[PDB]
Design a binder for this molecule. Structure first.
Ligand SMILES: CCCCCCCCCCCCCCCCCC(=O)OC[C@H](COP(=O)(O)OCCN)OC(=O)CCCCCCCCCCCCCCCCC
Ligand SMILES: CCCCCCCCCCCCCCCCCC(=O)OC[C@H](COP(=O)(O)OCCN)OC(=O)CCCCCCCCCCCCCCCCC
Ligand SMILES: CCCCCCCCCCCCCCCCCC(=O)OC[C@H](COP(=O)(O)OCCN)OC(=O)CCCCCCCCCCCCCCCCC
Ligand SMILES: CCCCCCCCCCCCCCCCCC(=O)OC[C@H](COP(=O)(O)OCCN)OC(=O)CCCCCCCCCCCCCCCCC
Ligand SMILES: CCCCCCCCCCCCCCCCCC(=O)OC[C@H](COP(=O)(O)OCCN)OC(=O)CCCCCCCCCCCCCCCCC
Ligand SMILES: CCCCCCCCCCCC(=O)OC[C@H](COP(=O)(O)OCC[N+](C)(C)C)OC(=O)CCCCCCCCCCC
Ligand SMILES: CCCCCCCCCCCC(=O)OC[C@H](COP(=O)(O)OCC[N+](C)(C)C)OC(=O)CCCCCCCCCCC
Ligand SMILES: CCCCCCCCCCCC(=O)OC[C@H](COP(=O)(O)OCC[N+](C)(C)C)OC(=O)CCCCCCCCCCC
Ligand SMILES: CCCCCCCCCCCC(=O)OC[C@H](COP(=O)(O)OCC[N+](C)(C)C)OC(=O)CCCCCCCCCCC
Ligand SMILES: CCCCCCCCCCCC(=O)OC[C@H](COP(=O)(O)OCC[N+](C)(C)C)OC(=O)CCCCCCCCCCC
Ligand SMILES: CCCCCCCCCCCC(=O)OC[C@H](COP(=O)(O)OCC[N+](C)(C)C)OC(=O)CCCCCCCCCCC
Lengths: 64, 132, 257, 69, 45, 53, 77, 105, 54, 88, 491
């Protein structure tokens, strides 16, 4: 991607696909809870990543 | 051995709701046979009012050591690295720079670093090569 | 940034090889065990998987001539070449990290391939290498884990190479003081601690394993338990942070909502 | 081997080792369709891509900077 | 009784699992690499 | 398949392809390690500079 | 129709209790402390911060007017 | 409940302690020859107290034994992969065999 | 015209049959398919066309 | 290839090897499927436990205490091992 | 050519259904043919009525000018002036779209009286749609509270076990609060002699009077979004109202509060809106944070969805009160996106699981992907849409609302970014449980998602993705209308 928002699209679906891959054996309790752990911790970074992009628009008016 | 997680009340009085000792279903024996084998629960077994904090879907509880002992070790580990870092700083044992840091010509590359004139030379230039 | 990118590219090749070969060992054993304590004496039964692990481990250990050496050894040098208080402290942390990198690689190899057998005899009479389809990516990665770093070093680590995408301020270019001003001892110190430290660990395991029966000593048991439980961070994260965050919702639900 | 209840459980991704009897016929129908999309992507990519470092001469940039002053 | 499992653990250190046979090949192709390097030196003289 | 009681495991006889491939892969690494040592051991340890020859 | 769900008495009592926790709530000192924190103390902290920096953050296109790096190096010797 | 020496219940309770003693030893000791020495040492510490008649004395040892097991417990015990707590536990569990019940939704 | 012009005698015969015939017995022919795929789906296409080619 | 299945013929050939290699087994003590442990083989409480621990290690399983106490003969062990999907 | 056609056609539609169904009610002991197949021919006519209502606004949409400032399609009807601008046009389309969806949701899951339900649903859709095209405060309030009468009876008749409590909550919470808004409207008609939108926007009242008017209006709005601590009615209503009632309530009614801010606060009380903005942010931020944490402890399946709507609309309130175009547009985008995803979550929970097992407790469900793969696909996809994952309209609305909040208030507006983490915490914990582990031991295997339920999920998913990938369809209409709401004097 040529801007941070296109990066954020891949950034989020990376966690989505990893969540579906870690918990691939969804009949196993540990895999199900492990996939949730990876997703929620990565979403914590995504929340800060959104805040950084918002400040980028505030200061420069662009994400390119 | 095992101990209950935090914020689990010792007592409660919710009217006529049955009062049972809080049990973490994660700690139950898995080699037994249950009606719900995945959750280690038998049919019609009563639930604690906060059973959602004491079941398999709750966060996994670690009971190898007490939290106070686990936090004592955690602080001790980083405490060692803190003293090790401060001693080298206060003692000043880290090596000196072998040479003068890198210098650059043209007033320290001021114009190439976004400077406009001599007023903003020090605002943008790197370390200026004073020896032409 | 050039150093980080080059080590990132090289690491993607030999670390993937380690996971592929590790999964090849798990498939080779019939019980599909994953604990290395139940392994032992696999070197002769699965030599092709062992060589992939052995080559990947040496590349990981920055053995000179391999991809990891040209990508990882320069970064450790750059810490001392920064010549600041933080860089000097991180250099020791990186130096110990490099020493441990060789230590757990030898320990992992010895338990899985060189230790006395721990699994039942029935496992070894049915222990065979996997098919060609599994092997094929590992061989391709193995070659890239030997020659890849040497060929690509000048692209990313060459002095003056144009990489305008990664911006380095003129005041932050320390590729000269890292390359020349370093004492000759620091150039080989990670190698000495790696190979020499690994040999000491290997000798203790083979002939004096009674030292590592750490269940006797109380301090060793706590130290082993503390690092085996991963700095107790998982317990602290769950029992304190996650539990309290859930209790705040419970307090909000009960006392407010 | 086992029982998977395949009579009604028909997910898009197969449901416990599923391969239709006419798998060869559909595979060819997919390979041709897949090939027809890579070529279409290639033609769209070539006709739409451009070099961002060559769309303006350096002389043009000098005039832009001087006017912006 | 001292080690009532002597006759069961014998196989774990005999035949393929002897100390010599376990490490006989711990460095894959070390001498093969020496030979090629030794041949390369003669080819470069 | 039959299990033989009290029989020690002999040296395994793997397929010749696996043994030859493993030695060649190791041979490639060791040769390359020595080849770079023959040409870069001064520069590696700081005993000499690359331009000096 | 066919009652596809095997109703559990313990689950129903657990569900009914959660939906009717308001019946047994008591405004004791424990409840008052939690009410004060969430409805008074926490809003006051945001209330002070919101107005303390209200109209005092001109971050749109903020410019740098101070050099970042040091010109001359002073050795520790 | 009181302890009944030389009974059937006591044999199961003692055998439960013996399994925990040897399984714990197997976790810490990763070599068979070093494990046999500890395994035989534990039994030599078990047969020594086999000739004890007073239940009151036997209660103390059971209390003592259940504290050594908790003190020597390995933080990462060895578990078979398909057993509870294993790596392959609950992996690809076959679906429940039951005929569907149609409903006019 | 059967829902409005039929008399009481003819209408009652159909309904008694319908309850018994339905009793003698998936999730198809519910009476919404023709309405939605002729009225609703083309309407959404028109909305899509407006935001595209207006 | 994987393990060539696990029939009771191969299961019996492996449990017998355990009893033969156990020195605490009484002298003579013919090993047959019908043979017991306390009587036919001469095993006390703790000796039988060690046999079961080798039994679970041999097939890479874990035998619960409740199920262990129900295994007192050789045929019961063969049947118990057979009735387990994770016996390898 | 809009309000006149919409009211007359729907009134004729109401009369047509009443005449047909109630003709033979005279103790005839009759059977009739209209009542065959659960009154299929009466449900079909009502469904056709909802579809035609959409075509009515489309005809006026063709003539809509996105480059024209001010209200368009100005019309006099019932002594009331009606008009359409960019913001009103999109909200009307969303309301009418949910008409057929709400009816189709309860096609064959009602115990009876389908004709009464169909008329009530269509009446609610039109009344809410008319509330976006009225051009005075009095007409706004009339349509704002006229929906209570059909909704109170709808919940009390077709509701769940606790329908009686839910009917009292919605009737009393939304009326006692709206009466405080009526007081502010009455004040406008006393001191200005008019409540017209254009007339009152040009009048500057005293700073003390604007404070009194803002409080009266905001009480009615804050209860309706809803905001904490006047939100407790919403979880009760959703958990007991019928599925079609939940769709309209979650998809349209809660959006009237955001539209109410646009009409009743920003252009007429601009000076006091700037002063109240820090207070609104503090309330909305706490509403967002508290609701997410409270959702983590809920056990009712439909209640969890109800609390999720509270957190999202807190972001909408934050965005709409930002004094920049980015925040205002993002709030409007999020309202449209929430108007599709939120009903879908109720359909998955209260329309698919409930219609099969009739129990909303969470403990009865786990591992539903084993025998309901189609259900799990939509459940996972809509769960990610609800959490603000990109390619969905919710992400576009949330990101712009958060960005606009930071532009409005960099320090405390940054706290709105916590919605990215908190929303994923409760939404995925529910989805991870419903799909993970083995199939529930308390459930019998039954049918997966049927064709009718597939249609509802697909045509609620499609608008979300289109808006998420290409929101310029929405932004182009909104840009001129939304730019009028900004109050700033840069010198
Ligand atoms: C800020 C503090 C956190 C506040 C968030 C609200 C409290 C937690 C709510 C999340 C829902 C909890 C849940 O769904 O169940 C717990 C879940 C189970 O996963 P787990 O126990 O790790 O199983 C591993 C098996 N091998 O475990 C999880 O999936 C939770 C994953 C972690 C959640 C991330 C929250 C932020 C973490 C960074 C803060 C700590 C920084 C140090
Ligand atoms: C912004 C929203 C966060 C507001 C933070 C509120 C912190 C708080 O009030 O925690 C109270 C709670 C102690 O309350 P409690 O455990 O009920 O004491 C009686 C025990 N028998 O303590 C906790 O539950 C731990 C909370 C720590 C994180 C803050
Ligand atoms: C605004 C007015 C704020 C009034 C606060 C009333 C708080 C309250 O309800 O007190 C609790 C008490 C019920 O008793 P209880 O819940 O058991 O708490 C006792 C703890 N030891 O309640 C009582 O003792 C009964 C007294 C209630 C008085 C209500 C009068 C309201 C008049 C003004 C309405 C506005
Ligand atoms: C054919 C004869 C029909 C009556 C003709 C007539 O003159 O009635 C007036 C009006 C026609 O319109 P017109 O005269 O041009 O002036 C606009 C006033 N509506 O026609 C009408 O006004 C009839 C309107 C009847 C429907 C009004 C019912 C109100 C619906 C509830 C209110 C919802 C909105 C608030
Ligand atoms: C899941 C994560 C979700 C999000 C978690 C919470 C993070 C968001 C909120 C944290 C704040 C984000 C960043 C805001 C600070 C950025 C502004 C800044 O640059 O700080 C310095 C600035 C002062 O600038 P200065 O030039 O020195 O002023 C001169 C005036 N003559 O301005 C300042 O003075 C700083 C203002 C005080 C610091 C406020 C931060 C505390 C906020 C606490 C929130 C509750 C916890
Ligand atoms: C938990 C304990 C972690 C280690 C504690 C470090 C103690 C110390 O002394 O660290 C001091 C360091 C170094 O910077 P300095 O020496 O303050 O200034 C000198 C500035 N240079 C280095 C540019 C010349 O800065 C820190 O703290 C680093 C940030 C905290 C990281 C965690
Ligand atoms: C770099 C500096 C040297 C560190 C490596 C020493 C060898 C080692 O850690 O091993 C030595 C021992 C044991 O051996 P083991 O490696 O655990 O294997 C044997 C596995 N048992 C124990 C199950 C049989 O470990 C320890 O309990 C050392 C302390 C743990 C943290 C490592 C160092 C922390 C300071
Ligand atoms: C940019 C985004 C592009 C996404 C497109 C990718 C292809 C989609 C494939 C769908 C079919 C599928 O895999 O879901 C269905 C499969 C079917 O199970 P099965 O493997 O056939 O075996 C069947 C054995 N059961 C029956 C025991 C499962 O699994 C499931 O029920 C998993 C439940 C969650 C599905 C999540 C779908 C992906 C979410 C994406 C979020 C954006
Ligand atoms: C070479 C060409 C390459 C590209 C191929 C493109 C293939 C397109 C798909 C065709 C198959 C199809 O539409 O499948 C539809 C599927 C399959 O289930 P069903 O049809 O309902 O059958 C079951 C019902 N029964 C039993 C009554 C017959 O439905 C779904 O649940 C789809 C749910 C949506 C999943 C994806 C969401 C993505 C969201 C984000 C988007 C960026
Ligand atoms: C936009 C302006 C509209 C205003 C007029 C609407 C129609 C009024 C009712 C007259 C006809 C009638 O009472 O008929 C009853 C109809 C038909 O229901 P049914 O199932 O056939 O009746 C049952 C007979 N069975 C069982 C034999 C089939 O149901 C209704 O009550 C629907 C309309 C009223 C909904 C809201 C009621 C409260 C209104 C409060 C206003 C503030
Ligand atoms: C400014 C923002 C205002 C927002 C709305 C204000 C609160 C609304 C409460 C809903 C009541 C309800 O629903 O009435 C129904 C409830 C029924 O109670 P129940 O749920 O069955 O439980 C209680 C029954 N038991 C114990 C048997 C289980 O009867 C009441 O309580 C009757 C009194 C209601 C008076 C409301 C007047 C409000 C005045 C205006 C604000 C000062």
């Amino acid at each position: 991607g040529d801007n941070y928002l296109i990066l954020f699209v891949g950034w989020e679906f990376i966690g989505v696909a990893s969540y579906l891959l870690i918990s691939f054996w969804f009949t196993r309790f540990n895999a199900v809870k492990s996939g949730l752990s990876a997703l929620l911790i990565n979403r914590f970074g995504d929340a800060l990543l959104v805040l950084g992009l918002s400040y980028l628009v505030l200061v420069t008016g662009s994400v390119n | 051995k095992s101990f209950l997680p935090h914020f689990i009340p010792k007592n409660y009085s919710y009217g006529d709701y049955p009062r049972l000792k809080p049990e973490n279903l994660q700690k139950r024996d898995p080699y037994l046979k249950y009606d719900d084998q995945a959750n280690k629960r038998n049919f019609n077994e009563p639930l604690h009012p906060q059973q959602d904090d004491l079941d398999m879907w709750a966060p996994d509880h670690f009971d190898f050591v007490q939290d106070s002992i686990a936090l004592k070790w955690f602080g001790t580990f980083f405490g060692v690295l803190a003293v090790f870092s401060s001693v080298i700083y206060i003692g000043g044992l880290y090596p000196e720079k072998p040479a003068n840091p890198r210098n650059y010509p043209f007033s320290g590359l001021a114009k190439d670093l976004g400077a406009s004139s001599e007023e903003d030379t020090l605002l943008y230039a790197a370390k200026i090569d004073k020896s032409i | 940034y050039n150093l980080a990118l080059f080590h990132l590219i090289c690491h993607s090749f030999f670390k993937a090889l380690l996971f592929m070969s590790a999964g090849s060992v798990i498939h080779s054993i019939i019980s599909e065990y994953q604990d290395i304590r139940m392994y032992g004496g696999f070197r002769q039964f699965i030599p092709l998987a062992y060589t992939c692990i052995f080559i990947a481990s040496l590349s990981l250990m920055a053995i000179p001539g391999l991809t990891g050496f040209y990508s990882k050894d320069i970064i450790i040098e750059s810490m001392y070449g920064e010549y600041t208080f933080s860089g000097f402290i991180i250099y020791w942390f990186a130096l110990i990290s490099a020493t441990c990198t060789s230590l757990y690689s030898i320990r992992l190899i010895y338990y899985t391939f060189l230790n006395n057998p721990n699994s039942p005899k029935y496992i070894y009479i049915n222990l065979k290498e996997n098919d060609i389809v599994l092997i094929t990516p590992m061989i391709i990665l193995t070659i890239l884990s030997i020659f890849g770093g040497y060929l690509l070093r000048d692209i990313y680590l060459g002095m003056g190479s144009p990489f305008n995408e990664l911006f380095i301020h003129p005041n932050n270019l320390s590729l000269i003081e890292t390359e020349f001003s370093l004492p000759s001892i620091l150039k080989v110190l990670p190698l000495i601690t790696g190979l020499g430290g690994g040999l000491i660990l290997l000798l203790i395991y083979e002939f004096n394993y009674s030292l590592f029966l750490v269940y006797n000593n109380k301090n060793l048991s706590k130290l082993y338990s503390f690092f085996n439980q991963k700095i107790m961070f998982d317990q602290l994260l769950n029992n304190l942070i996650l539990r309290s965050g859930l209790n705040i919702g419970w307090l909000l639900n009960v006392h407010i909502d | 081997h086992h029982i998977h209840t395949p009579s009604y459980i028909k997910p898009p991704t197969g449901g416990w080792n599923f391969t239709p009897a006419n798998w060869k016929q559909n595979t060819v129908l997919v390979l041709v369709g897949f090939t027809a999309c890579c070529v279409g992507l290639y033609k769209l990519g070539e006709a739409g891509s451009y070099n961002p470092k060559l769309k303006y001469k350096e002389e043009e940039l000098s005039r832009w900077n001087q006017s912006a002053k | 009784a001292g080690n009532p499992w002597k006759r069961r653990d014998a196989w774990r250190s005999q035949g393929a699992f002897t100390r010599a046979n376990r490490f006989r090949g711990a460095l894959p192709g070390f001498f093969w690499g020496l030979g090629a390097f030794g041949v390369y030196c003669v080819y470069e003289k | 398949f039959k299990y033989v009681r009290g029989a020690i495991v002999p040296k395994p006889k793997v397929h010749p392809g696996y043994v030859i491939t493993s030695k060649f892969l190791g041979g490639l690494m060791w040769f390359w390690i020595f080849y770079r040592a023959k040409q870069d051991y001064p520069v590696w340890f700081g005993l000499k500079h690359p331009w000096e020859h | 129709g066919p009652h596809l769900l095997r109703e559990d008495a313990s689950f129903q009592r657990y569900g009914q209790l959660r939906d009717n926790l308001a019946t047994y709530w008591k405004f004791n000192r424990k409840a008052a402390r939690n009410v004060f924190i969430f409805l008074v103390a926490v809003p006051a902290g945001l209330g002070y911060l919101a107005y303390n920096y209200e109209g005092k953050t001109p971050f749109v296109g903020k410019r740098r007017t101070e050099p970042i790096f040091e010109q001359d190096y002073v050795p520790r010797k | 409940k009181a302890v009944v020496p030389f009974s059937e219940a006591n044999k199961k309770y003692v055998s439960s302690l013996y399994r925990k003693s040897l399984r714990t030893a197997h976790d810490w000791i990763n070599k068979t020859e070093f494990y046999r020495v500890k395994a035989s040492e534990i039994r030599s510490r078990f047969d020594a107290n086999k000739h004890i008649n007073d239940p009151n004395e036997l209660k103390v040892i059971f209390k003592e034994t259940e504290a050594l097991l908790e003190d020597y417990a390995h933080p990462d015990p060895i578990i078979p992969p398909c057993r509870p707590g294993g790596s392959k536990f609950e992996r690809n569990i076959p679906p429940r065999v039951e005929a569907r019940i149609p409903i006019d939704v | 015209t059967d829902y409005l012009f039929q008399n009481a005698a003819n209408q009652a015969l159909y309904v008694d049959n319908e309850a018994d015939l339905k009793e003698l017995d998936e999730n198809e022919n519910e009476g919404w398919e023709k309405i939605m795929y002729v009225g609703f789906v083309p309407t959404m296409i028109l909305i899509f066309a407006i935001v595209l080619f207006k | 290839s994987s393990t060539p299945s696990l029939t009771k013929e191969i299961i019996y050939d492996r449990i017998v090897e355990i009893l033969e290699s156990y020195d605490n087994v009484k002298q003579g003590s013919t090993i047959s499927p019908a043979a017991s442990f306390s009587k036919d083989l001469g095993l006390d409480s703790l000796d039988t436990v060690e046999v079961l621990l080798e039994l679970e290690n041999e097939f890479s399983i874990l035998i619960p205490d409740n199920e262990a106490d129900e295994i007192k003969t050789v045929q019961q062990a063969v049947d118990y091992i057979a009735a387990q999907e994770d016996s390898i | 050519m809009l309000v006149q056609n919409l009211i007359i056609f729907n009134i004729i539609g109401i009369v047509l259904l009443v005449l047909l169904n109630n003709n033979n009610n005279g103790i005839l002991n009759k059977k009739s043919l209209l009542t065959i197949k659960n009154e299929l021919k009466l449900k079909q006519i009502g469904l056709i009525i909802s579809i035609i209502n959409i075509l009515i606004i489309i005809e006026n949409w063709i003539g809509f000018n996105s480059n024209y400032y001010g209200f368009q399609n100005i019309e006099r009807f019932l002594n009331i002036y009606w008009g359409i601008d960019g913001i009103s046009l999109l909200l009307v389309l969303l309301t009418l779209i949910l008409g057929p969806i709400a009816i189709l949701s309860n096609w064959k899951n009602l115990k009876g009286y389908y004709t009464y339900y169909v008329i009530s649903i269509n009446m609610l859709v039109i009344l809410m749609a008319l509330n976006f095209i009225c051009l005075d405060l009095v007409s706004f309030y009339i349509l704002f509270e006229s929906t209570l009468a059909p909704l109170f009876l709808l919940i009390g008749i077709y509701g769940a076990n606790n329908k009686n409590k839910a009917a009292y909550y919605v009737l009393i919470y939304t009326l006692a609060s709206s009466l405080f808004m009526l007081l502010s409207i009455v004040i406008y008609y006393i001191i200005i002699n008019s409540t017209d939108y254009i007339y009152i926007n040009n009048i500057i009242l005293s700073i003390n009077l604007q404070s009194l008017l803002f409080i009266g209006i905001i009480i009615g709005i804050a209860v309706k979004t809803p905001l904490m601590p006047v939100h407790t009615w919403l979880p009760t209503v959703h958990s007991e109202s019928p599925l079609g009632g939940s769709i309209l309530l979650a998809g349209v009614i809660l959006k009237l509060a955001i539209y109410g801010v646009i009409r009743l606060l920003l252009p007429n009380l601009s000076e006091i809106s700037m002063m109240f903005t820090p207070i609104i942010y503090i309330i909305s931020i706490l509403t967002l944070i508290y609701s997410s944490l409270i959702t983590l402890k809920q056990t009712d399946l439909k209640v969890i969805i109800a609390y999720s709507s509270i957190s999202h609309l807190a972001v909408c309130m934050i965005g709409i009160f930002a004094n920049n175009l980015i925040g205002i547009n993002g709030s409007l985008i999020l309202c449209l996106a929430h108007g599709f995803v939120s009903p879908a979550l109720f359909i998955l929970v209260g329309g698919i699981l409930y219609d099969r097992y009739h129990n909303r407790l969470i403990n009865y469900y786990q591992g539903l992907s084993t025998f309901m793969p189609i259900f799990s696909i939509y459940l996972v996809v809509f769960s990610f849409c609800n959490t603000g994952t990109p390619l969905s309209g919710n992400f576009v609305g949330e990101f712009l609302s958060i960005t606009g909040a930071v532009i409005r208030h960099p320090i405390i507006g940054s706290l709105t970014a916590a919605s990215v983490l908190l929303s994923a915490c409760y939404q995925m914990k529910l989805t991870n449980r419903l799909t993970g582990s083995v199939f529930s031991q308390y459930l019998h295997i039954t049918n997966d998602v049927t064709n009718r339920e597939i249609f509802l999920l697909n045509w609620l998913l499609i608008p979300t993705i289109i808006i998420g990938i290409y929101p310029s369809f929405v932004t182009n209409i909104l840009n001129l209308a939304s730019s009028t709401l900004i109050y700033s004097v840069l010198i």
